[PDB]
């Protein structure tokens, strides 16, 4: 399974963009953690998700 | 405790607005189910969430 925000989800094979769209996420308003990496929502990589991947989608707030 | 998409979270006091913004979702891109009652993202109630509330947030897809 792929871990999304702390929950196991059958996401293997899907790209982050595909996943974010299925979440109804505003790309410009979030950052995405893929394992030991971070991306702005608009600049996530196209590498298909793999088993064991850990993904965290975080909303960018104003301090 | 408030159930959000099946998961328990301490969102009491927060409005749905606020929760959606903390989720970083597109208001226009989702539908929200407050206790089995459905709202378009932009037209969610403004009352603060309370213990026992069941919330479901679903992205609106294009079928076709």
Question: What is the domain partition of chain A in residue ranges?
Answer: 2-63
Q: Which fold has domain A2-63?
A: Ubiquitin-like (UB roll) (3.10.20)
- The verdict on a CB contact (< 8 Å) between A58 and B24 is yes
Residue of B nearest to A29 (CA): B24
d(CA B22, CA B20): 5
Classify B29 as helix, strand or coil: helix
Q: Can you give the resolution of this entry in Å?
A: 1.7
Element at A55 (helix H, strand E): strand A54-59
Of B21, B22, B25, which is closest to A24 when you measure between CB atoms? B25
> Could you tell me which residues come within 8 angstroms of residue A55 by beta carbon, excluding any fewer than 6 positions away?
A2, A3, A4, A5, A11, A16, A19, A32, A33, A34, A49
Method: X-ray
- The verdict on a CB contact (< 8 Å) between B25 and A22 is no
Q: Tokens 């607005």 label which residue?
A: B17
Maximum distance among all Cα pairs of chain A, rounded to whole angstroms: 36
Contact criterion met (CB below 8 Å) for B10 and B4:
no
Of A9, A13, A1, which Cα lies nearest the Cα of A49?
Answer: A13
| DSSP 8-state class, residue B16 | H
CA Rg value for chain A: 11
Query: Does domain B2-64 bear CATH number 3.10.20.30?
Result: yes
Of B24, B26, B61, which is closest to A57 when you measure between CB atoms? B24
- State residue A45 phi and psi, 5-degree precision: -70, 165
**How many residues belong to chain B?**
64
Contact criterion met (CB below 8 Å) for B30 and B58:
yes
């Amino acid at each position: 399974m792929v871990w999304l925000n702390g929950e196991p989800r059958p996401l293997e094979g899907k790209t982050l963009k595909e996943v974010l769209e299925e979440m109804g996420v505003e790309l410009k308003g979030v950052a995405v953690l893929l394992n030991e990496e971070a991306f702005l929502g608009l600049e996530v990589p196209d590498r298909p998700l793999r088993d064991g991947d850990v993904v965290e989608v975080v909303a960018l707030m104003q301090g």
